[PDB]
Amino acid sequence: KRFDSEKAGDREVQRTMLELLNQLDGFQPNTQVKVIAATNRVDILDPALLRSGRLDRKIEFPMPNEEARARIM
Amino acid sequence: RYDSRTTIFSPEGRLYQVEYAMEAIGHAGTCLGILANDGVLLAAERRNIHKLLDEVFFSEKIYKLNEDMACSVAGITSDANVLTNELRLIAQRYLLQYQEPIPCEQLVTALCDIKQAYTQFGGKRPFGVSLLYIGWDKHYGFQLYQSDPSGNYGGWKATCIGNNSAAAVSMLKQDYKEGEMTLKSALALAIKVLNKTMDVSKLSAEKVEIATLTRENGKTVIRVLKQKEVEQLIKKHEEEEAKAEREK
Amino acid sequence: CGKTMLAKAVAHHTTAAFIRVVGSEFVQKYLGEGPRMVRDVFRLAKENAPAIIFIDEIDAIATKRFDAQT
Amino acid sequence: LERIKDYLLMEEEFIRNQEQKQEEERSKVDDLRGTPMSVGTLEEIIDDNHAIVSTSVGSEHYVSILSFVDKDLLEPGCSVLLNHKVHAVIGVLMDDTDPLVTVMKVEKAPQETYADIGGLDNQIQEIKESVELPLTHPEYYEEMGIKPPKGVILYGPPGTGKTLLAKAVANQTSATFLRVVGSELIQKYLGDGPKLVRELFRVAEEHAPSIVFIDEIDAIGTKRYDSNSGGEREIQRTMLELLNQLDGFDSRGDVKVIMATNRIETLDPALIRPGRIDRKIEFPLPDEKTKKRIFQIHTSRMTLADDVTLDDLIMAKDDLSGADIKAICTEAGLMALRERRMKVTNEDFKKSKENVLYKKQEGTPEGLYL
Amino acid sequence: DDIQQLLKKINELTGIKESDTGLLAADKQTLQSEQPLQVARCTKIINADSEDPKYIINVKQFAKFVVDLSDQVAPTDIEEGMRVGVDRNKYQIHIPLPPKIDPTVTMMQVEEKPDVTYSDVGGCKEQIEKLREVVETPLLHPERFVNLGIEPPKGVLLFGPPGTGKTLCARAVANRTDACFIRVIGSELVQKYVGEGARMVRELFEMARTKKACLIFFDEIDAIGGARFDDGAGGDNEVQRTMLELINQLDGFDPRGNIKVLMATNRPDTLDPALMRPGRLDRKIEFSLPDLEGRTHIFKIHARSMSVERDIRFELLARLCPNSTGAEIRSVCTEAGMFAIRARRKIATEKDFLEAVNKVIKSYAKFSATPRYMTYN
Amino acid sequence: SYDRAITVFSPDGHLFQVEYAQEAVKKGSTAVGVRGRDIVVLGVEKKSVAKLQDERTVRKICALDDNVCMAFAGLTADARIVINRARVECQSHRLTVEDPVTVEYITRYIASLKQRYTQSNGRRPFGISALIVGFDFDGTPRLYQTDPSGTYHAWKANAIGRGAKSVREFLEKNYTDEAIETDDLTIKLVIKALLEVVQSGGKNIELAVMRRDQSLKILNPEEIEKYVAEIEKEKEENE
Amino acid sequence: RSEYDRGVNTFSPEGRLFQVEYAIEAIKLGSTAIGIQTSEGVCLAVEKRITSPLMEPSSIEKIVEIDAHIGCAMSGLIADAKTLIDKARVETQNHWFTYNETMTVESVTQAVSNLALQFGEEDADPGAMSRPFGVALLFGGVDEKGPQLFHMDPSGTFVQCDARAIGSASEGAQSSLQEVYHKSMTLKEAIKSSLIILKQVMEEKLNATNIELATVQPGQNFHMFTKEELEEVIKDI
Ligand SMILES: Nc1ncnc2c1ncn2[C@@H]1O[C@H](COP(=O)(O)OP(=O)(O)OP(=O)(O)O)[C@@H](O)[C@H]1O
Ligand SMILES: Nc1ncnc2c1ncn2[C@@H]1O[C@H](COP(=O)(O)OP(=O)(O)OP(=O)(O)O)[C@@H](O)[C@H]1O
């Protein structure tokens, strides 16, 4: 989540996040390049990264079901 | 932490809920009594005086409990009404069973055991009422008593419970004389103690309620002094202060 | 009931440096930020005429760098 | 008027402290060294004598070393000294610890031995066996097979003079004493503060036998509670570094730790464990016999009337701390000076106790109830 | 006052003494040649070009410099992605520079071996056995695991009450590891610059990768940002990045490969969920308060050095210790010797320990250990 | 586990709320008891006169029946309830069995009442540790004490309340077969033990004596003073 | 633990019952009691652990008589043991009253266990025994079957034991018992064995005041208060 720390802050990390947003927003209309991203927690992610089309695809991974667990083992 | 249930005991063996209730009695009208040789007296502060309130009810903090006993109540108003009824009931119940007026210490012990029970049982909060008992019994003569929300009771030649109790107790300890109280002198001690404890200036008659219990012709004659009787005592205290002027 | 319309009016009719300085505005994250506001007023009052402060928007504190120990 | 001799002794001592080159070899080194020399880290060592040196500007050029006294002391992480312009290693690496660490070292202890303290004799015995005794007679511990206890915690109510025991240890200790408050690790920068804890310990090891006092340890380590709001104290990281130094891999060599807390329950269990605090010392509020010795010690260097009854003050009032006793003695002297009497009457002591104990109000209705 | 004068006279005598007291070829020819010798500041090459190479180098904070090779150099010797030294005045790569050692990461490696045998640790045979097949047997004899086609856990978390013995076991593994042991300084990983510590964690893995089969001991994992609240204030943002960098390098997109990670925490609950998740740390070896057989063994090992009567019963002493950590049992043995020293008896007796058992446990404000309640008998 | 809840246990195995009740007993005024060949005696302390307060109402030593008397240490009101219930049982035992209550029975009854409060929530364990001293039928003198935990024990001599431990240590050295030799010597042993923890007040003692053939009598203040003076003379003779 | 120990009503995610385990812990606070069952009879030995010289030794009852043929030893809360001991005493007499015969040791152990089981039935005497009892009882008696020793536990679980130990030092005592116990042991041999084990596992020296011994054998009755023979047996050993 963009830090609201006043004055001194981890400004560089926010700049990196903005750079990814700059490429995602109004750019790469060609579908030749696609990006897959993963997070243990989606809560930390800013609403901006998802935006409307910047990262529209969502692939929720559910905890394994009983049938799935037998197969996974 | 160790609050809420009267049942929980703190790591220092302290029942905080009972202690809180005993501290709570402080926010109440001052009630004081003097043993007085040849008499006994109860004096109270009539707080919450307003022009609209009628004050039609005879008394307000002073309730008789028997032909030969009386009490003054300081505490939660509702709890007081519950306790006064039970004290009146215990007094008649003893008379029905033994056909003799209840000895004063016993009426106090019985209410105190009821108050004590509330502290030992989880469901109820400890009573928030503390009261002073004035009466005459053949076994031990004129007596004065104090009850606590904890359920503990004591007999005091003089004591005070509501508002600035410590100030009255300090004034009473110095002024009181053992065996020389002589009722009329005890009434003066009360007016002087009341003036100090009450922040009220001039101790007007409406603010003070005085009840005196005496044994006349073999019959206890509990009487609540009328406003005119209270007024003369106040004027005498004011005149005594005028005599004190210059000399002091 | 008209207290703040009067408060703003005093600022309009004042010849003093009436920086209304509602409690929270240009104020930064701080603990006990009452000094920063008053110190500015003393200097400005000295520069021109005694300055006047109106206390409103009193959310100057409750900042991110804030919280009692427990 | 013997004060003049004492004042002269102090001035003479300061003068003594104030009063505390080779014909060709030194002059050549003086020419070789620059007028300004900048000290920087050594990153890499090369046999050619041109060794990479890291600097604040990060110029890591290999630089030749020509040290007349010795050039074999070069090591990784050593702070080498370089010429301002040429940047060549001038000579033997500078060897000074960080400034914040230097302040802690104490060379002079104002208090004397355990004599000033009275009635904490059991507490004195424990501190001595852990601190003074192992150094004085190392053979006893080896014969028993015991390794001497290295850590002590002094926990007591306010004014029981836990610090006085520490001042007494400073008076009679072979070991260098580093006096650091627990609240002296507030470094704002992320990092640095845990590193400062490492710095204090490395200096203690350098000085060989050393005693570390950490008064008010409650601030540095308490509870080890979770981040919660997310402020993240970073104090927990600092405490963890102290926990690592006391018993976290490696060894503590010969360093002894004395720590003092008004409240011991708040302190986190890991810090207060055998291996970090082998011996625990408790200072209780003084009783009667302990009070008698303290009252005598405080009044020993003042005029005392025969009328004054020291026993009466001690027995009549119970709860006064050792510090409270000293305050009564200072207040009593002031009470007498008001009447212009240098000598102190019994009446003055009685008035003094009342004035000192006016802020201590305790208890509620717990009288009739029990 | 005369005695004070004697000291003042002594000081005056010292003052008189101080005032009265007042009344290699390297420094030769080599210096004359050395002062002219030029410097070559270190820089890192990123690229090379055809014809004139025009290698472009970032100094380390200065700029991308298009520097031609120096006249007295071999073009093949200069390489892309190689540290080099460029003279400022001649603006050319006079000499190439060897790759940076990064010594602080090298320092964390134990190098020395702690002299503690597994025998000294006592009362935790099961905890030792679990560590043996994630630390010693997979490395010493990988063939057995391969025969069942079973991979080693490659990760271990030691958690327990403080003083249980988690670190003591770890030093014992270091004694017989026969592979690089890398103790990690938790404070070192936190750094003033943003993500400077995260760079170090990459270096930690890189050093681990270069050595063949190594165990990394992250003691006090809580210090290494072992939590991920990651609140909006982001006070721990720099450390949180350092923690995530450790997690990814530990596992995901090619993991440790030959690295076994041992992590020890007094509070396991605080550790962040991603680190707790297995694969990063498959085994969860929790150390536990020792049982009566363990309590006797810890007493026997600690007391073997101390001189004592041969008839002492450790079983009784261990029974008297209802729930004692190994450190507290060691504290009883040392305290028992201290009581004998106080009475000046060279050989201690069973009674001395019983006094210590009261002192170490009951005398401490456990409250349960000291009984004033008749309640139960 | 949890301290707050009479019935929750602890991982160590302790009902802490019951132990917290024992604290109220310690804060109570010291009371001592001795078993004499014919004069079981109990001593009390802290008369703590309050100036304008009558002391007939304060009754730390309360008789339960003719052959048995009791001294309570702890919350005053809780003690009043236990004493009255014990008094009713003593009379009931006579109605159910026409024989006077043996001292053990009344201590077992007091223990059972105390245990019943401990067993369930909604009730507070009683904060008293009464000492019961009496002579049973057949003329055997006996002393028993009851803890707030509901346990009961028989003691040759014991102390309860503030500074009980100090009095017991004094009795451990002082209590001897000789000391119980004479009725006065037994009264003296209680006075000497009580004096140690009673401060220098001396007047703040109310020792009561059971003749074991007659009735409980509270000793006169003057009579108590005479014994105190006799003890001082004996101490001077030893010097 | 980690919560779910608030009541016997709650069940652990593991399925364990906390509070019942906590009551099992309370027995450890108790002094060790050792019981050995032999063909000649059952021997019970206990550590009196007298707190003070002044307190009367008889008032601490560690070995009690349930009936002439049955004796019991208790380690754990004193008050809890009393409620269970009274039930066993009423039950043995009630079984005599209804069936004119001596109750078997196993049946008394079963009857006592039935009250112990009601930690929270929610039907029986509501407002009573809301928590598990904290006392482990060793019942040693000679019945029609022969000498029998039975151990009950706070959870209502009872078992016949040739030799058993309860209380603090029970674990140490059991290990010693497995080595010492044999089927042919005489009661006299068992009595010496029990005190020898008790001496090793008790910090105080095994003087006659420290140890209380009890023996029930078919020919005699309870005879479970050896008196002054406590001195005789100890001196011979
Ligand atoms: N004296 C007035 N003459 C004309 N309009 C007025 C007057 N007083 C108030 N009003 C009107 O009422 C509105 C409310 O005033 P205002 O918001 O200042 O009230 P307030 O009680 O001071 O509340 P707050 O402190 O929240 O601002 C004004 O903006 C204006 O429209
Ligand atoms: N099982 C044991 N065998 C031998 N010594 C032990 C044992 N358990 C603890 N100790 C003693 O305790 C100390 C070892 O503590 P260790 O280094 O294991 O750290 P720890 O206190 O368990 O770690 P942490 O502080 O992170 O909880 C040494 O004094 C050691 O002798």
State whether the Cα torsion F42-F43-F46-F51 is positive or negative: positive
Instruction: State the Cα–Cα distance between residues F106 and F84, nearest whole angstrom.
Output: 12
- Within 10 angstroms of residue F112's Cβ, the number of other Cβ atoms is 17
**Measuring CA to CA, which residue among B176, B221, B185, B198 is closest to residue B67?**
B221
Asked whether the beta carbons of F54 and B154 are under 8 A apart, the reply is: yes
Burial of residue E90 (number of CB atoms within 10 Å: 0-12, 13-18, 19+):
middle
The answer to whether E295 and E329 have CB atoms below 8 angstroms apart is yes
How far is residue E250's CA from residue E263's CA, in Å, rounded to a whole number?
12
Task: For residue C31, give the DSSP letter.
Answer: S
User: Which stretches within E253-309 are classed as H helix?
Assistant: 273-276, 292-304
E349 is in an annotated binding site: no
Amino acid letter, B17: Q
Residue tagged 């592979």 (tokens): E179
Ligand 2 centroid from CA D247, angstroms: 9
Question: What's the burial of A10, exposed, middle or buried (CB within 10 Å: 0-12/13-18/19+)?
Answer: middle
Gap between the Cα atoms of E328 and E296, Å rounded: 13
Identify all chain E residues contacting D129, using CB atoms and an 8 Å cutoff: 338, 341-342
* DSSP run (H or E) holding B40: strand B40-45
Sequence-ordered strand ranges (E) for chain A: none
Q: If you compute the radius of gyration of chain B from its CA atoms, what whole number of angstroms results?
A: 19
Q: Which atom of ligand 2 is nearest to the CA of E294?
A: 1
The reply to whether E334 touches chain F by the CB within 8 Å rule is no
Beta carbons within 10 angstroms of residue F202's beta carbon: 16
Q: Tokens in use for D215?
A: 């008064």
Contact D87 E236 (CB under 8 A): no
Query: How crowded is residue F225: how many other Cβ atoms within 10 Å of its Cβ?
Result: 14
Q: What CA–CA distance (Å, rounded) separates E241 from E197?
A: 9
Determine the Cα–Cα distance for residues E86 and E67; give it in Å rounded to an integer: 8
| Residue D365 to chain B, least CA–CA distance (Å) | 7
Hey, which chains touch A, using 3+ CB pairs under 8 Å?
C, E
Which letter does DSSP use for residue E358 in this model?
Answer: I
CB contact (8 A) between residue D5 and residue E8: yes
Residue E72 Cα to ligand 2 middle (Å):
61
Residues β-bridged to residue B29: none
Residue with tokens 């006299």: G188
Residues of E in contact with G169 (CB under 8 A): 316, 319
Instruction: Give me the residue from E323, E368, E375 closest to F151, CB to CB.
Output: E375
Residues whose CB falls within 8 Å of the CB of residue B185, separated by 6 or more in sequence, listed in order: B177
Our answer on whether the CB atom of C2 is closer than 6 Å to any ligand 1 atom is: yes
In what helix (H) or strand (E) does residue B218 lie, and over which residues does it extend?
none
**Euclidean distance between CA atoms A54 and A64, whole angstroms:** 29
Angle at D315 between CA D311 and CA D316, to 5 degrees: 115
**Residue nearest (by alpha carbon) to ligand 1 atom 8:** C2
Are E312 and E267 within 8 A, CB to CB?
no
Which atom of ligand 2 is least distant from the CA of E297?
A: 3
List all residues 6 or more positions away from G143 whose beta carbon is below 8 Å from its beta carbon: G69, G102, G103, G104, G105, G106
* Contact (Cβ atoms closer than 8 angstroms) between residue E27 and residue D91: no
CA distance B47 to B53: 12
Q: Which residues pair with B142 in a beta bridge?
A: B136
User: Which one-letter amino acid corresponds to residue B156?
Assistant: W
Taking Cα atoms as reference points, which of B119, B114, B117 lies closest to residue B17? B119
How far apart CA F137 and CA E124 sit, in angstroms, is 62
Residue appearing with tokens 């030593």:
F61
Tell the residue number behind the tokens 């039970």, with chain if given.
Answer: B86
The amino acid sitting at D96 is D
Report residue G64: phi and psi, to 5°.
-130, 160
Distance CA(F8)–CA(F121), nearest Å, equals 10
The alpha carbon dihedral of A13, A15, A19, A21 has a sign of: positive
d(C-alpha D51, C-alpha B79), whole Å: 91
Report the relative pairing of strands B208-213 and B40-45 from DSSP bridges.
Answer: antiparallel
Tell me the C-alpha distance between G148 and G157, whole Å. 16
Is E376–G168 a contact, with Cβ atoms under 8 angstroms apart?
Answer: no
Q: Which atom of ligand 1 is nearest to the CA of C8?
A: 18
Cα end-to-end span (Å), chain E: 68
- Which residue's C-alpha comes closest to atom 20 of ligand 2? E163
Helix B104-120 to helix F76-96 angle, to the nearest 10 degrees?
100
Whole-angstrom distance, CA of residue G173 vs CA of residue G175: 6
Q: How far apart (Å, rounded) are the C-alpha atoms in residues E46 and B49?
A: 93
C-alpha distance from D370 to closest chain B C-alpha (Å): 9
Please indicate whether residue C6, judged by its CB atom, sits closer than 6 Å to ligand 1: no
Q: Given phi > 0 = left and psi -120 to 50 = alpha, else beta, which region is D161? A: left
For residue G196, give the CATH number of its domain: 3.60.20.10
Distance CA C68, CA D159 (A): 27
Do residues G27 and G171 make contact, with C-beta atoms less than 8 angstroms apart? no
Which protein residue has the closest C-alpha to ligand 1 atom 14?
A: C2
Residues in chain G: 237
CATH code at B158? 3.60.20.10
Distance from CA of D310 to the nearest CA of E (A): 30
Contact assessment for residue E360 and residue E322, using Cβ atoms and an 8 Å cutoff:
no
Helix (H), strand (E), coil (C) string for chain G: CCCCCCCCCCCCCCCCCCCHHHHHHHHHHCCCEEEEECCCCEEEEEECCCCCCCECCCCCCCEEEEECCEEEEEEEEHHHHHHHHHHHHHHHHHHHHHHCCCCCHHHHHHHHHHHHHCCCCCCCCCCCCCCCCCEEEEEEEECCCCEEEEEECCCCCEEECCEEEECCCHHHHHHHHHHHCCCCCCHHHHHHHHHHHHHHHCCCCCCCCCEEEEEECCCCCCCCCCCCHHHHHHHHC
Phi/psi at D278 (nearest 5 deg)?
Answer: -65, -40
Q: Of E39, E223, E346, which is closest to D87 when you measure between CB atoms?
A: E39
Using an 8 Å Cβ cutoff, are G194 and G164 in contact? Answer: no
For the record, the structure tokens of E95 come out as 């000499």
Nearest CA-CA distance, residue E323 and chain F, Å: 9
CB contact under 8 A, F25 and B13: yes
- Whether the CB of G49 is below 8 Å from some CB of chain F: the reply is no
Resolution of this structure in Å: 3.0
Ligand 1: residue whose CA is nearest its atom 25: C4
Give CA–CA dist E174/E116, Å, rounded. 9
Q: Do G55 and F156 touch (CB under 8 A)?
A: yes
D151-155 and D279-282: which strand pairing?
A: parallel
Residue nearest to atom 9 of ligand 2 (CA): E326
Q: Side chain identity at D98, as an amino acid letter?
A: D
Q: Min CA distance, E375 vs chain F (Å)?
A: 6
Instruction: Confirm or reject: Cβ of E121 under 6 Å from ligand 2.
Output: yes
Whole-number Å distance, alpha carbon C1 to ligand 1 midpoint, is: 5
Range of the domain at B10: 1-246
Tokens representing residue E154 in the block: 């490659």
Classify the phi-psi angles of E264: left when phi > 0, otherwise alpha if psi is within -120 to 50, otherwise beta: beta
Residue labelled with tokens 């036998």? D209
Domain that holds residue G105: 5-237
Q: Do G70 and G108 touch, CB atoms closer than 8 A? A: yes
Tokens 């056995």 map to which residue? E129
Place of tokens 């040693």: G140
Specify the DSSP element, H or E, that contains E143.
Answer: helix E142-147
Give the whole-angstrom CA distance, residue D112 versus residue D110: 7
Chains near B, with 3+ CB pairs < 8 A? D, F
Distance E262 CA to ligand 2 centre (A): 16
User: Closest residue (by CA) to atom 19 of ligand 1?
Assistant: C2
As a whole number of angstroms, the distance between CA D255 and CA D177 comes to 10
F19 contacts on E by Cβ (under 8 Å): 373, 375
Mutate which of G48, G203, G204, G205 to disrupt the E interface (most E C-beta within 10 Å)? G203
Alpha carbons E21 and E7: distance in angstroms, whole number: 21
Q: Are strands E83-87 and E92-96 parallel, antiparallel or unpaired?
A: antiparallel
Q: What are phi and psi of D226, to 5 degrees?
A: -70, 165
**Quick one: closest CA in E to D272, which residue?**
E162
3-state secondary structure of D139: helix
Indicate yes or no: CB of E376 within 8 angstroms of CB of G29: yes
Q: Which of F182, F184, F183, F179 is nearest to F157 (CA)?
A: F179
Query: Domain count of chain G?
Result: 1
Distance from the alpha carbon of residue B178 to the mean position of ligand 2, in angstroms: 72
Distance CA E20, CA E17 (A): 5
Pairing state of beta strands B153-155 and B158-160? unpaired
Looking at the complex, report in whole angstroms how far the Cα of residue E283 sits from the nearest Cα belonging to chain G.
20
The DSSP 8-state label assigned to residue D11 in this structure reads: H
The answer to whether the CB of E122 is under 6 A from ligand 2 is yes
The DSSP bridge pattern shows strands G33-37 and G135-142 to be: unpaired
Q: Is G29 on the interface with F (CB under 8 A)?
A: yes
Contact C64 A7 (CB under 8 A): no
- Tell the CATH superfamily of the F1-239 domain: Aminohydrolase, N-terminal nucleophile (Ntn) domain (3.60.20.10)
Chain-chain contact of A4 with C28 (C-beta, under 8 angstroms): no
Do residues D325 and D298 lie in contact, with contact meaning Cβ atoms separated by under 8 Å? yes
D370 → chain F, closest CA residue: F75
Query: Is E252 among the annotated ligand-binding positions?
Result: no
Between CA D109 and CA D95 the distance in angstroms is 27
**Which residues are CB-neighbours of F120 under 8 A, at least 6 positions away?**
F6, F7, G127, G128, G130
Strand pairing category for F61-63 and D255-261: unpaired
Tally of domains within chain B = 1
Domain residue limits, chain F: 1-239
Q: Do A5 and C28 touch (CB under 8 A)?
A: no
Q: Answer positive or negative: Cα dihedral of F62, F64, F67, F69.
A: negative
| Residue written as token pair 């410099």 | E65
CA B126 – CA B118 distance, rounded (Å): 6
Structure tokens at E231: 């609140």
User: Does the beta carbon of C5 sit less than 6 angstroms from any atom of ligand 1?
Assistant: yes
For G14, phi then psi, to 5°, come to -65, -20
Which residue owns the Cα nearest ligand 1 atom 6? C2
Report which protein residue has its CA nearest ligand 2's atom 24: E162
- d(CA E355, CA E367) in angstroms, rounded, equals 17
Distance between CA atoms of residues G226 and G232, nearest Å: 10
Q: Is the CB of residue B232 less than 8 Å away from at least one CB of chain F? A: no
Angle between helix G78-99 and F103-119 (nearest 10) = 110
Interchain contact, F111 vs G79, CB within 8 Å:
yes
> Which residues are CB-neighbours of D175 under 8 A, at least 6 positions away?
D131, D135, D207, D209, D210, D211, D256
Alpha-carbon distance of F131 to F147, in angstroms, equals 9
What are the structure tokens assigned to G21, written together?
């385990």
Q: Is G58 exposed, middle or buried (0-12, 13-18, 19+ CB in 10 A)?
A: exposed
Q: How far apart are CA F113 and CA F86, in angstroms?
A: 9
